[PDB]
Amino acid sequence: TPDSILASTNLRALLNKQTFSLLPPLYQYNLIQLLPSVDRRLSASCLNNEFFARACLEWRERLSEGEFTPENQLK
Amino acid sequence: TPDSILASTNLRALLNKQTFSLLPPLYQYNLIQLLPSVDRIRLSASCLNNEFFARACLEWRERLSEGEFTPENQLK
Amino acid sequence: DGWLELESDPGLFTLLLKDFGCHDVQVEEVYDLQKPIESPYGFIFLFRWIEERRARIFVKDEEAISSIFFAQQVVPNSCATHALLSVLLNCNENNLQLGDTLSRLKTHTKGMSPENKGLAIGNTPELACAHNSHAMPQARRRAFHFVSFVPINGQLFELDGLKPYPMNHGGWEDSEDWTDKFRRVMAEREQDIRFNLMAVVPDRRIAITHKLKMLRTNQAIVSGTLQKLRDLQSLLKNLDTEIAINEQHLADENDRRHMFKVDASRRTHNYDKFICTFLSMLAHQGVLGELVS
Amino acid sequence: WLELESDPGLFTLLLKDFGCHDVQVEEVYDLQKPIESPYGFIFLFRWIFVKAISSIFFAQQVVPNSCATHALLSVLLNCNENNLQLGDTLSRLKTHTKGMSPENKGLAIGNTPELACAHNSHAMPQARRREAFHFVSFVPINGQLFELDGLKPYPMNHGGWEDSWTDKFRRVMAERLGDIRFNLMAVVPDRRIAITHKLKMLRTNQAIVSGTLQKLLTARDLQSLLKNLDTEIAINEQHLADENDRRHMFKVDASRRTHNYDKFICTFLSMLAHQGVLGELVSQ
């Protein structure tokens, strides 16, 4: 929920290959379609990165600091 | 000087290659005769810049200051 | 003008120079100057300041000589590209083959004024697309002062892109190479600063493969002579061990290049579209994330 | 016995005066930098539980100030005579102590005259006998590094290896103290023979100049090959020259360390007082 709700979680550990392996294949495929060009089994470092962790942190911050609720349809 | 005449000098600097070059040849040769087997008229300047030469001069002033090696030293 | 901020990372710069057409070039990070490196094309120096406190020697060159590539940085966020071009464009074409999109610039700006030579840097599009192609997605905007050390002819020129004049150090002794003079100017400094220093050398693999040729020829010269009925097997043994050593070295180099390629392919990606769809797929079934701080 | 200066050159010239030709003692500055075939290490302090059969040389040091000789003999006499040629007067001792008790093997060390004359032959005139540099010797027999301490009654073992012993020596540097000016040296074989061997194995390729001519009715312009490898030959040449020059340096420092300068000083000063040229500038 992008309305500053439960943004205080440790997403870097929440989003792991185990929580990823808890998804159906026809959803994991759609997921890796949004992954970098390391698309092609999973290369465990794919979800343990400096840029991925800083990404998740700039995400939860990007939600708490300023809400990106449906107000966010500015262009 | 057996015990105490001008023993308070900084001999390590007093005895330099220049004061050696201030001596007649027929005395400088006599000097190098008292040098180690590195004898073989020039002077290899490091010959007088050594840890062991300085320690020699210092154990020398000690041998003069701490206990005189005057003819008293015939305890043997 | 307006360019994109970049992460200071030797892999990013190596892939940048590859994206500039200059292939036979490389930037390794130096941790101590004492360990020597073969044929360094030129060094790059980086300051930082955490608590600002700053708001960023008269040995400048006064004569209006723009024969060397010096350009005042007018394009913001172009620090890194300006420094790299400053260390490359003042070297010998004999020693290195620079990319045609680089040599076109170096020969285009013969004797140009720096205040618009840096503008010539800013105007080249195939350079701005390559430099901007490596910015992190958090460059959604709408530190790291670079100083380049390169000699032209026995004179170690400290090129500062922000200062108006290039600083020369003029070190020449026929007993020492210029890398010996570079360390003497490294009288740095020490409080809380996150400085960093890199070295621009040529691609190590080009010096390696040549050694694999000059070695494998002797590997190929195995003169087994028969008198129809001296023994230097240990020689082929030792040089074969050398061949294996340089093989593992080269493999380590290509592995470093692949690693930089991975870090670059992840640094560029914008994960937002990935995270949302991810979370909604968990909150569809596995709503309960009990990893709250 | 007499105290000696702790200096790798002094020990090199000691072993050279012991007949051990293919030997040298260099000081190690970092454990990471590898050295080829170290015969054994020596450990030195300046400010201060493992295991019968004592067939190996662990002679208890009974003679004071014999620390250096004890460490060197401790690292050498537990190596292969096949690998290195020790002086006949040394190997005679090594075979003279077959299974002897250590507590009196050091007395056999004390009785050897060519050991007191050669070891005492390098003492400074300041050897007037009337916390310290304790020596600890590391030598392997078969994959097991025995820490030999001449003052402790038993030798300490540290373990084996994994074939993936010099690597095992660094594993023993997990020691914390707490203040100490310790120092560590390494006993290697004479570098110059391993240099000359490379000068042969190089100068054969220098000699293999296959000049083939395509001017009459892989092989290409390879002048740069003989050029670069020739530069390598010159590099190893300068290495060897530097080594023999180091030997000359040790010979000079040894010829000055032994000399007693007092008789020289007296004559010098008296020769100044002969023409009254005193030191009326330097004082205190």
Author numbering:
A (entry chain B): 214 to 253, 275 to 309
B (entry chain D): 214 to 253, 274 to 309
C (entry chain A): 44 to 99, 109 to 194, 211 to 257, 264 to 303, 335 to 398
D (entry chain C): 46 to 93, 110 to 112, 116 to 194, 210 to 243, 246 to 259, 266 to 304, 333 to 399
From the paper:
With the goal of understanding how PR-DUB activity is coordinated, we have solved the crystal structure of the Drosophila Calypso–ASX complex to a resolution of 3.5 Å. Two copies each of Calypso and ASX are present in the asymmetric unit. In each of the two copies of the Calypso–ASX complex the globular Calypso UCH domain is linked to the C-terminal ULD region by a coiled-coil hairpin. The Deubad domain of ASX packs at the hinge between the coiled-coil and ULD helix of Calypso, restraining the ULD in a pose protruding away from the active site. Whereas Rpn13 consists of seven helices that wrap around the ULD sequence of UCH-L5, only four are defined for ASX. The crystal structure reveals that the NEF-motif sits directly adjacent to ubiquitin in a putative substrate complex. Using size-exclusion chromatography coupled to multi-angle laser light scattering (SEC-MALLS), analytical ultracentrifugation (AUC), small-angle X-ray scattering (SAXS), and chemical crosslinking we demonstrate that Calypso–ASX forms a higher-order complex in solution containing two Calypso and two ASX molecules. Oligomer assembly is mediated by a conserved patch on the surface of the coiled-coil of Calypso, and disruption of this interface impairs recruitment of the PR-DUB to nucleosomes and removal of H2AK119Ub marks.
The PR-DUB was first characterised in Drosophila melanogaster, where it consists of the deubiquitinase protein Calypso and a binding partner Additional Sex Combs (ASX). The PR-DUB complex plays a vital role in regulating H2AK119Ub histone marks, and mutations in human PR-DUB genes lead to a spectrum of malignancies. The overall domain architecture is shared between the human and Drosophila PR-DUB components, with the exception of a large insertion (~380 amino acids) in the ULD domain of BAP1.
